[PDB]
Design an enzyme around this catalytic site. Structure first.
Site, short mmCIF file in Angstrom:
data_model
loop_
_atom_site.label_atom_id
_atom_site.label_comp_id
_atom_site.label_asym_id
_atom_site.label_seq_id
_atom_site.Cartn_x
_atom_site.Cartn_y
_atom_site.Cartn_z
N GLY D 30 0.77 -1.23 0.00
CA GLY D 30 0.00 0.00 0.00
C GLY D 30 0.80 1.29 0.00
O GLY D 30 2.03 1.27 -0.09
N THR D 31 0.08 2.40 0.09
CA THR D 31 0.66 3.74 0.13
C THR D 31 1.42 3.92 1.44
O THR D 31 1.12 3.27 2.43
CB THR D 31 -0.43 4.81 0.07
OG1 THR D 31 -0.84 5.01 -1.29
CG2 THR D 31 0.06 6.11 0.67
N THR D 32 2.41 4.79 1.46
CA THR D 32 3.16 4.99 2.69
C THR D 32 2.55 6.10 3.56
O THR D 32 1.94 7.04 3.05
CB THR D 32 4.69 5.26 2.40
OG1 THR D 32 5.22 6.15 3.38
CG2 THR D 32 4.90 5.81 0.99
N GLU D 47 0.53 9.64 2.02
CA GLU D 47 0.65 9.82 0.58
C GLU D 47 -0.68 9.46 -0.09
O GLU D 47 -1.30 8.46 0.25
CB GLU D 47 1.77 8.91 0.07
CG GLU D 47 1.74 8.55 -1.42
CD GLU D 47 2.82 7.53 -1.82
OE1 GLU D 47 2.87 7.12 -3.00
OE2 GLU D 47 3.64 7.14 -0.95
N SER D 75 -1.96 2.14 6.29
CA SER D 75 -1.51 1.72 4.97
C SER D 75 -1.99 0.30 4.67
O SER D 75 -1.98 -0.56 5.56
CB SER D 75 0.03 1.73 4.92
OG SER D 75 0.55 2.93 5.48
#
Lengths: 244, 198, 111, 244, 241, 242, 243, 233, 250
Positions: D30-32, D47, D75
């Site tokens: 996933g996104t950080t 993010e 995340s």
């Protein structure tokens, strides 16, 4: 999920058979043999205690012959524990009937009830069947003396003489060979002992390995009496019939 | 209330039940049959609360007929009455109890003897030569105590009733519009369609 | 002890003309000898050309009108925006009312 | 044998729970996002990959608030994150209703912990596909926490998870050294916007949107609030500046 | 609490558990029924794998649901009891609420529903039973004969059979029963029935039981003799040729 | 095994698909809708000359303005028709009016996906999907005469003509040509009776086939054998007339 | 067949693999701990290994305060440790409420052991991959150490150790007792008993400790508490001067 | 791989995926195309309806949840019925209890949460349908995209279904153009009908083949079918 | 959540065996040996206290438990299962008997109860059989002294003497030699100490052995006096000391 570990005890085989039931029957077939013979004046229940020891207490026991009612008793073949669960519900059913109608429960009504219970574990619940077969010996004022049999499938039938457990095939043939409609209780007591004596997987057929019970209607009275022979009484009846 | 009388003679049981059905100020019907046939040789008469009365009888009838079919046998009068008592004894401690009193009369084909059972809404059962529910007993029991004999013929019984019904028509305040009589014996149940002037 | 009901007075009237109909009602809401409001609408437009009023115990009257309006809303959602005929609305109101047969909407309602 | 990785509560021969581990893979994918504990509060940043020009900016908010003083960012599988917050919100309302005082951050952590750990006990459920960084101010200090799908969680000086998890962790370790006495709220906000830009390298292919939130006893009164407008831009730039 | 779906569809579109339910019926002893012009008759074969039974009490193959309707079956015995019980109860309930005994079609539709319900409910297997239900509607004299199966499907027949070798005996009936002129006698009807059983029972005066149902709750089973009497005459019918 | 409500890699529900396969094995049923009424016909298809063909009930009445034909595992349709009749009657009790044909259908289709061993959405207790498809035909004041096709997938389509069963794809292609927006009730009857004769293994007569219609005037009626036998004769004649 | 390794049913050898694998999980943290009994106190020592620098060292513990008198150290994953701690806290709280006195250490142990035995027999409950060591100075039994495992087994110890290097610690302790001939550390102050603990911990492990490498819990009459980084440092310094 | 991890939703793959969900997402692409676009005053939904035979009707794809909200579906119709119906209640609840119209952003949250519950527990299956939700609330026009995975996103415009990528590019390019079509609904509807035909291929949008819905400043979510959309074909 | 395991985990196999019960019995086989001997005026049950570390306190773990003041039990197999079984047993003794009839249940009946509990774990949904075998010894006014053995299947039988566990076969043989229907309690306590010597490898003293008997009433173990009919418990666990004193004359 859990579906992974589900045996599915209640499904049909491609042949239309119940896996678990057939296997339960296969189990029963290795249990001590039990004979049920119905005479004109009584009924005889005989059973062979499969495997024993010198220390095994034979007096403080009754592992295969159980009293259900005052007029009904059964011989067990299979898991003693499973049998006790069914027996107890059966003893309860008899009493509810008595309290409801103020009359003892007709033998067939009690046998059908228990069979139906067994049949249930066959069609739903996902639980294993009871690995037990019963021979019912009882009396009532509608059919007099009656002999029945019920197995894991939940099916039950009536007999003049029948056997359950191991070597039933051999035993049923011997019985079907010397049984006679007019037989008297003591004749039956003898046929039973002879039959077991010829199917046993043991050396001799001593008294410590036997259980005997008779539902006779003692002439001197006018009613029915159940008698579960004590160790000694089995020892005697064993000498008389000539097996010392 | 209603009239519910029963008398057990030599070879049969006789049940007399009033025909009136009164709702408040008016008598709605004068030909009501306050009875049900539980089996070919067992009859039950009843009186009590407006709805509970028939509902209970038909519920009891249904169960007895079911037993008969399942077992292809006819329960003894004693057995049927014990069953009915248990039912009443159960409802007495329930949310809404059946307020019904009954008389069960049957002929025990196995003992070859007629039997009469009286059970009140509380589940109080007693076996009697002759019985009644409500106020009926108050007028008739003295007549029955006097003239009753265990060996009476069905005919002597119908005459003893006739006498009872007359005392009732004389001293009781309510017009119960006569009774319907039925006999239970070794041959089943039949109705004496002529007691209005027997 | 607690009494779940009250009376907010007011009166309503309904007359049906040949090609029209009216439903009137004063706008006074009271409690005992006091006035709660000199202007509290008591007759409502529920859609599909149906006007209704539930007079008596305000709280119950409002709850009914509110439940009916919602009934109309869902009638559309379920039967493809079909119009709810006045005769059908009535039958619906009966079930709304009888639904509380043993804890009644303390109102006399007219549509 | 094998198959120890098909059911959510099975122990493999080495003592692990593969499903919980496979869950983590969804997290890393996933996104950080990160968390920076300051001298009197905490800062959360994440993010937001901009799939296209069709995504209305500033509208698909990811950071969430629990009660009035807690900030939660995660995340991995977004839906799971929400499910975990919804729970935390109830968990927190329950605590306030009984004790009056709003739930302490440590106390709140264990609630989420126990709940998450719970989804690793039965094979009839799946573990949470998210790692969550949350925290806030309370009766005695500020607290920053990170929770894993295993239900494991600890208090952190700084924390991060998602794709750019290594970049972030690096930046954080520096700050921890170059600020032994403690960073400030205003500072952490900028420092955070930076670490996100940097860590966005492991996903430099797609354009993103920044999001920051903080909870400072002095800057926000101990209440969680979103960094918007001017204070936001000031930190965006501070980043764009050190991104070159 | 057990609700595993045992009866589900397979790629080809079959419900294997219902399928196998039928296989158990094939294994069951044979049962047959033919309707006359003023009656209906039910025939069933008695196995002989084991003989030394007490026929007095051993459950019979034809059961009375009410005093005007009977039900025979093929398949698992234990299972049949469950259906018979529910039907007998449903029969009393119907009398109690509609104030009139069930029509044979209704009683059949009921037993069929119970059967069908077990084909799509969790934790339960279908009934390994197929049945024949016959009788006369109340105050009616036109005979009725229906059949039900594990699937829950039912329909009426002029004559039908189920169980082992039903294929064979059905054949006999298809070319021995004329709808134009059905067995106008209670006698010639019971005969046509025994004849078909013999096609598969292979000598069995004690291996064949018949029950005759006439209008207005007139049911009665024949004793070995009455039956062996039809057997005797039917064997001669052949030899005299 | 595998969840009774799992998805195939293609995005389909196994159980529902296999459900449709069982319907392809059922007797053919055809529906034609015209501005004069809607016609429903079905292939009886007994399995033995001893089976009394009139006890085959593949066409039933929902309400007075709605009727329906089934195809596939017919025993599975009992509860569906019950639910339907109840929904119609119920609706009438609540609103003092006839239930719209579409609404009745939508209601029946709601049972469709209520299956599984514990699907989180309510208490959908039904081990498998329904193995039968339905042709629901009726008339209401808002949309007039209508024909609907309800499947075990929960989805339902409205058709001007439609066929389901063993000969569906074949008979459907036939209907594709034959159907025009100005057919008459009489035409539709013959037309249905014709497509049936083409797809039926058996030779169509008034005992292995059954017709019925639903008109705003006399509602839903099932043509008795005599009336149909004649429509068959009138058809044989019209076909040999060129 | 092959599934008798996934759920808790017997294997043909009469074994329960899932319970054996849960035992494996108890060493996943690579932490070692030990406990000894003073004359009137009980001490528990456990390694504190905080790898990441981003971690707030003060929130990293495997020692819990179950009740005013009971202390529990856990060997195994932290989520299972916290699950076990919460349960035990609740159990000790309720026990007091229902019976009028504080739940004894050995009893709470039996209760938790019984709870663990359940997961051993029921198939939908997985065992907890942890080993629980309970300590306190019971009002009737004095200093007490009771430990439970995933198998549901439990017993009281004179002293004990748990972790990867469990055996080295144990034999070290075994020997000290074969020598002293008594079943406890003969000291009056707990500070000295704590020192003894940290000392033998070092001998058996062959490693030196700083003030952030340990974790100490002390149980005394009417109270169980844990030492702080500095309370420990003070303990380290003391043993330093003598060696 | 996959083979052993797509048995049900409660199972994670070794890579960290939920196949049952991805399969659900698949049924969406196999579904007919639909488009969504909004300005600052209105929001429009244009959808392509599908039919079986030429004797069958075209399956509706637009559903009205309240007076200020509605959506379009792509995939399993039944699931849209379930979801739209759950959303209808949520709107009704907000109106009755709080006398407030439900914020479009909040409707999305509810949908996301309902869908997620079906991806973490044994026995249930993920919803197999995609939804585009338009609505004019207290903060203007709104458009949302719902994915069975439980992911909901707010956009200016978008499309889902087969060949949906055509319309999605047209719109991603036409952005600055329609985002300003305020005050004029007929322009947004035309722009929508255009973006949607960018995903055509088989036929050309006919009268009983097209379906358009709109809501805005002074427009209560209304649906247009047949002749009603003729002036846009 | 929720026990989705509502089906049996013990089922019949084609041969007719019940796997899980067989396996449970195998578990009992690996357990430490335990035994029981019935004298004419008492019963004795005993086992070995297999310590799992010299650091463990062997007293804080009894393998011999009192079920009622006249019934004791001992086992072989999985200790934990035994523990929960003992609790359920002590309780059923009350709920199913003392609370109805005002007296403790007779040995055979309590054994029957225990046996029932074990049977259900053999057929109920989602569980495995108990991995133990018990030897229950007690005394009741109308049956005197008795000794029973309950297995994982739930079956149970009475014995004059017997052993279960590791070296049950060897021990059962040694018992048949030394048993007679005229033994006095002390004679059996002796025979017990001998039979158990063969099983124990290491130390054999009153601290490595656990032994209790069912004999005479211990009015000193009652706790009060004033009620004539209450004379005390017949169950007494021997002390470490009482053991050694007999270990000498061994």
């Amino acid at each position: 999920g859990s579906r992974r570990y589900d045996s599915r005890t209640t499904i049909f085989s491609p042949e239309g058979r119940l896996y678990q039931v057939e296997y339960a029957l296969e189990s029963i077939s290795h249990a001590g043999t039990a004979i049920g013979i119905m005479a004109s004046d009584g009924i005889v229940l005989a059973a062979e205690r499969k495997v024993t020891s010198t220390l095994l207490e034979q007096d403080t026991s009754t592992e295969k012959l159980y009293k259900l009612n005052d007029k009904i008793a059964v011989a067990v073949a299979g898991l003693t524990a499973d049998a006790e669960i069914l027996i107890n519900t059966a003893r309860i059913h008899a009493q509810n009937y008595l309290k409801t109608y103020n009359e003892d429960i007709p033998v067939e009504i009690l046998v059908r009830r228990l069979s139906d219970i067994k049949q249930g574990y066959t069609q739903h619940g996902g639980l294993r069947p009871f690995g037990v077969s019963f021979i019912y010996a009882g009396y009532d004022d509608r059919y007099g003396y009656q002999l029945y049999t019920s197995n894991p499938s939940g099916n039950y039938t009536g007999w003049k003489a029948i056997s359950v457990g191991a070597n039933t095939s051999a035993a049923q043939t011997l019985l079907q060979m010397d049984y006679k409609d007019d037989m008297k209780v003591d004749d039956a007591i003898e046929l039973a002992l002879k039959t077991l004596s010829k199917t046993t997987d043991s050396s001799a057929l001593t008294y410590d390995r036997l259980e005997f019970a008779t539902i006779r209607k003692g002439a001197n009275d006018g009613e029915v009496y159940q008698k579960i022979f004590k160790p000694q009484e089995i020892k005697d009846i064993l000498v008389k019939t000539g097996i010392t | 209330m209603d009239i519910i009388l029963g008398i057990r003679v030599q070879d049969s049981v006789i049940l007399a039940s009033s025909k009136a059905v009164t709702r408040g100020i008016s008598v709605l019907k004068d030909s009501d049959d306050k009875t049900r046939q539980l089996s070919p040789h067992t009859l039950m008469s009843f009186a009590g609360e407006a709805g509970d009365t028939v509902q209970f009888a038909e519920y009891i009838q249904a169960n007895i007929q079911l037993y008969s079919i399942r077992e292809d046998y006819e329960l003894s009068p004693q057995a049927v009455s014990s069953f009915v008592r248990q039912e009443l004894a159960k409802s007495i401690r329930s949310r809404r109890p059946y307020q019904v009193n009954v008389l069960i009369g049957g002929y025990d084909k196995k003992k070859n003897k007629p039997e009469l059972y009286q059970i009140d809404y509380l589940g109080t059962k007693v076996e009697l030569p002759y019985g009644a529910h409500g106020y009926s007993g108050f007028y008739t029991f003295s007549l029955l105590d006097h003239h009753y004999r265990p060996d009476m013929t069905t005919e002597e019984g119908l005459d003893l009733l006739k006498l009872c019904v007359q005392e009732l028509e004389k001293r009781m305040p309510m017009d119960f519009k006569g009774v319907i009589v039925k006999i239970v014996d070794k041959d089943g149940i039949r109705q004496v369609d002529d007691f209005q002037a027997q | 002890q607690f009494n779940p009901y009250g009376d907010n007075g007011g009166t309503i009237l309904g007359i049906a003309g040949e090609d029209f109909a009216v439903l009137a009602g004063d706008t006074r809401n009271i409690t005992d000898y006091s006035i709660n409001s000199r202007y509290e609408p008591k007759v409502f437009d529920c859609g599909d050309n149906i006007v209704m009023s539930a007079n008596g115990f305000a709280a119950d009257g409002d709850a009914l009108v509110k439940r009916f309006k919602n009934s109309v809303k869902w009638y559309h959602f379920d039967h493809n925006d079909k119009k709810l005929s006045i005769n059908s609305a009535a039958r619906n109101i009966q079930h709304l009312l009888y639904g509380k047969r043993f804890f009644p909407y303390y109102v006399h309602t007219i549509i | 044998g094998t198959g120890y990785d098909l059911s959510n509560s099975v122990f493999s021969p080495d003592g692990r729970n593969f499903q919980v581990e496979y869950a983590v893979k969804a997290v890393e994918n996933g996104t950080t996002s990160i968390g920076i504990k300051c001298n009197d509060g905490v800062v959360f940043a994440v993010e937001k990959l901009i799939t296209s020009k069709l995504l209305v900016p500033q509208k698909n908010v990811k950071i969430q608030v629990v009660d009035r003083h807690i900030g939660c960012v995660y995340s991995g599988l977004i839906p799971d994150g929400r499910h975990l917050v919804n729970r935390g919100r109830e968990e927190a309302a329950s605590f306030k209703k009984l004790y009056k005082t709003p739930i302490p951050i440590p106390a709140f952590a264990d609630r989420l912990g126990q709940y998450v750990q719970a989804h690793t006990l039965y094979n009839s459920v799946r573990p949470f596909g998210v790692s969550t960084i949350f925290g806030g101010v309370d009766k005695n200090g500020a607290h920053l926490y990170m929770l894993e799908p295993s239900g494991s969680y600890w208090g952190y000086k700084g924390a991060a998870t998602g794709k750019g998890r290594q970049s972030a962790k690096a930046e954080l370790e520096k700050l921890v050294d170059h600020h032994p006495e403690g960073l400030s709220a205003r500072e952490a906000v900028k420092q955070a916007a930076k670490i996100i830009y940097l860590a966005h390298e492991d996903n430099k292919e797609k354009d993103f949107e920044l999001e920051i939130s903080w909870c400072s006893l002095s800057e926000t009164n101990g209440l969680h609030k979103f960094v918007k407008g001017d204070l936001l831009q000031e930190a965006i730039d501070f980043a764009q500046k050190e991104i070159n | 609490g057990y609700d595993r779906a045992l009866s589900i569809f397979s790629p080809d579109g079959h419900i294997f558990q219902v399928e196998y339910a039928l296989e158990a019926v094939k294994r069951g002893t044979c049962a047959v029924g033919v309707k006359g012009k003023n009656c209906v008759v039910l025939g069933c074969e008695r196995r002989s794998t084991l003989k030394l039974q007490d026929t007095r009490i051993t459950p019979s193959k034809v059961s009375k649901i009410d005093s005007h309707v009977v039900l025979s079956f093929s398949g698992l015995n234990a299972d049949s009891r469950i259906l018979i019980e529910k039907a007998r109860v449903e029969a009393q309930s119907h009398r109690l609420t509609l104030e009139d005994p069930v029509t044979v079609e209704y009683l059949t539709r009921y037993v069929a529903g119970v059967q069908q319900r077990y084909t799509q409910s969790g934790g339960v297997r279908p009934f390994g039973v197929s049945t024949l239900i016959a009788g006369f509607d109340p105050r009616d004299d036109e005979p009725k004969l229906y059949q039900t199966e594990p699937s829950g499907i039912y329909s009426s027949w002029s004559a039908q059979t189920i169980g082992r070798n039903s294929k064979t005996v059905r054949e006999f009936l298809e070319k021995n029963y004329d709808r134009k002129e059905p067995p106008a006698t209670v006698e010639e009807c019971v005969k046509l029935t025994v004849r078909s059983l013999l096609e598969v029972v292979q000598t069995g005066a004690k291996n064949i039981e018949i029950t005759v149902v006439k209008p207005d709750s007139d049911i009665v089973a024949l004793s070995s003799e009455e039956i062996n009497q039809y057997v005797t005459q039917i064997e001669q019918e052949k030899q005299e040729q | 095994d595998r969840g009774v409500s799992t998805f195939s890699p293609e995005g389909r529900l196994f159980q529902v698909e296999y459900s449709l396969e069982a319907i392809k094995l059922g007797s053919t049923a055809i529906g034609i809708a015209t501005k004069e009424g809607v016609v429903l016909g079905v292939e009886k298809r007994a399995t033995s000359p001893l089976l009394e063909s009139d006890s085959i009930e593949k066409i039933v009445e929902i309400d007075r303005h709605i009727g329906c034909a089934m195809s596939g595992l017919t025993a599975d349709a009992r509860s569906m028709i019950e639910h339907a009749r109840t929904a119609a009657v119920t609706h009438n009790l609540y609103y003092d009016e006839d239930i719209n044909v579409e609404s009745l259908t939508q209601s029946v289709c709601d049972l469709a996906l209520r299956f599984g061993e514990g699907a989180s959405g309510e208490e959908r207790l039904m081990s498998r999907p329904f193995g039968v498809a339905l042709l629901i035909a009726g008339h209401d004041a808002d949309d007039g005469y209508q024909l609907f096709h309800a499947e075990p997938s929960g989805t339902f389509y409205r058709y001007n003509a439609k066929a389901i069963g063993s000969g569906s794809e074949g008979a459907q292609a036939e209907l594709l040509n034959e159907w025009h927006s100005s057919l008459t009730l009489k035409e539709a009857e013959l037309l249905v009776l014709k497509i049936l004769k083409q797809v039926m293994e058996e030779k169509l007569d008034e005992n292995n086939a059954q017709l019925s219609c639903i008109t705003k005037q006399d509602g839903f009626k099932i043509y008795d054998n005599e009336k149909t036998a004649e429509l068959i004769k009138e058809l044989k004649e019209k076909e040999a007339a060129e | 067949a092959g599934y008798d390794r996934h759920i808790t049913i017997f294997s043909p050898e009469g074994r329960l693999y899932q319970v054996e694998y849960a035992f494996k999980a108890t060493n996943q943290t690579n932490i070692n701990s030990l406990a000894v009994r003073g004359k009137d106190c009980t001490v528990v020592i456990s390694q504190k290994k905080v790898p990441d620098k981003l971690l707030d060292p003060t929130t990293v513990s495997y020692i819990f305060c179950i009740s005013r008198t009971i202390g529990m150290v856990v060997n195994g994953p932290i989520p299972d440790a916290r699950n076990a701690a919460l349960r035990a806290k609740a159990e000790a709280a309720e026990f007091r409420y229902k019976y009028g006195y504080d739940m004894p250490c050995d009893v709470l142990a039996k209760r938790m052991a019984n709870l663990s035995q359940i997961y051993t027999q029921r198939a939908y409950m997985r065992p907890l991959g942890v080993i629980l060591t309970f300590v306190s100075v019971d009002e009737e039994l004095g200093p007490s150490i009771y430990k439970t495992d995933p198998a549901g087994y439990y017993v009281g110890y004179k002293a004990t150790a748990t972790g990867p290097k469990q055996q080295e610690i144990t034999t070290n302790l075994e020997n000290h007792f074969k020598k002293s001939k008594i079943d406890h550390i003969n000291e009056e102050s707990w500070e000295k008993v704590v020192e003894f603990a940290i000392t033998h911990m070092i001998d058996a492990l062959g490693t030196e400790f700083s003030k952030n490498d340990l974790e100490v819990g002390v149980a005394t009459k009417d109270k169980f508490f844990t030492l702080s980084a500095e309370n420990i440092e003070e303990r380290l310094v003391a043993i330093a001067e003598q060696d | 791989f996959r083979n052993n991890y797509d048995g049900d939703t409660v199972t994670f793959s070794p890579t960290g995926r939920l196949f049952q969900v991805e399969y659900a997402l698949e049924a969406i692409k196999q579904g007919s195309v639909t488009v969504g676009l909004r300005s600052n005053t209105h929001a429009v939904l244009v959808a392509l309806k599908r039919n079986a035979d030429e004797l069958s009707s075209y399956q509706k794809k637009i559903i009205k949840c309240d007076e200020h909200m509605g959506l379009s579906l792509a995939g399993l119709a039944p699931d849209a019925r379930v979801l739209s119906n759950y959303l209808r209640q949520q709107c009704n609840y907000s109106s009755l209890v709080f006398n407030r119209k439900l914020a479009v952003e909040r409707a999305g949250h509810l949908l996301c949460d309902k869908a997620q519950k079906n991806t973490q527990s044994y026995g249930g299956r993920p919803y197999g349908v995609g939804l585009l939700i338009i609505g004019y609330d207290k903060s203007g026009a709104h458009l949302l995209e719902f994915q069975p995975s439980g992911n909901v996103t707010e956009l200016y415009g978008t499309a889902i279904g087969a060949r949906s990528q055509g319309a999605k590019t047209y719109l991603e390019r036409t952005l600055d153009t329609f985002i300003k079509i305020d005050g004029n609904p007929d322009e947004l509807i035309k722009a929508g009908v255009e973006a949607i035909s960018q995903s055509l291929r088989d036929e050309s949008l006919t009268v009983d083949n097209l379906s358009i819905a709109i809501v805005g400043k002074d427009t209560p979510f209304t649906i247009y079918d047949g002749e009603a959309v003729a002036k846009y074909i | 959540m929720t026990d989705r395991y509502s089906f049996s985990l013990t089922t019949f196999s084609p041969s007719g065996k019940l796997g899980q019960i067989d396996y449970a019995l195998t578990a009992v086989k690996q357990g430490v040996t335990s035994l029981g001997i019935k004298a004419t005026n008492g019963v004795v049950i005993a086992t070995e206290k297999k310590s799992s570390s010299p650091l463990a306190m062997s007293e804080t773990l009894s393998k011999v438990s009192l079920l009622t003041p006249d019934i004791g039990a001992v086992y072989s197999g999985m200790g934990p299962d035994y523990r929960v079984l003992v609790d359920k047993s002590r309780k059923v003794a009350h709920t199913s008997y003392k609370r109805i009839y005002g007296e403790y249940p007779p040995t055979k009946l309590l054994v029957s109860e225990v046996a029932k509990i074990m049977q259900e774990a053999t057929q109920s949904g989602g569980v495995r059989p108990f991995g133990v075998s018990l030897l229950i010894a007690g005394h009741d006014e109308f049956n005197g002294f008795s000794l029973y053995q309950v297995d994982p299947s739930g079956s149970y039988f009475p014995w004059k003497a017997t052993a279960i566990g590791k070296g049950s076969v060897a021990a059962k043989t040694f018992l048949e030699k030394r048993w007679n229907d005229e033994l006095e309690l002390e004679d059996a306590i002796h025979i017990a100490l001998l039979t158990l010597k063969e099983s124990v490898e290491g130390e054999f003293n009153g601290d490595t052995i656990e032994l209790a008997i069912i004999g005479d009433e211990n009015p000193d173990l009652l706790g009060y006096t004033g009620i004539p009919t209450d004379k005390g418990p017949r169950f007494r666990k021997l002390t470490s000391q009482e053991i050694n004193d007999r270990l000498e004359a061994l």
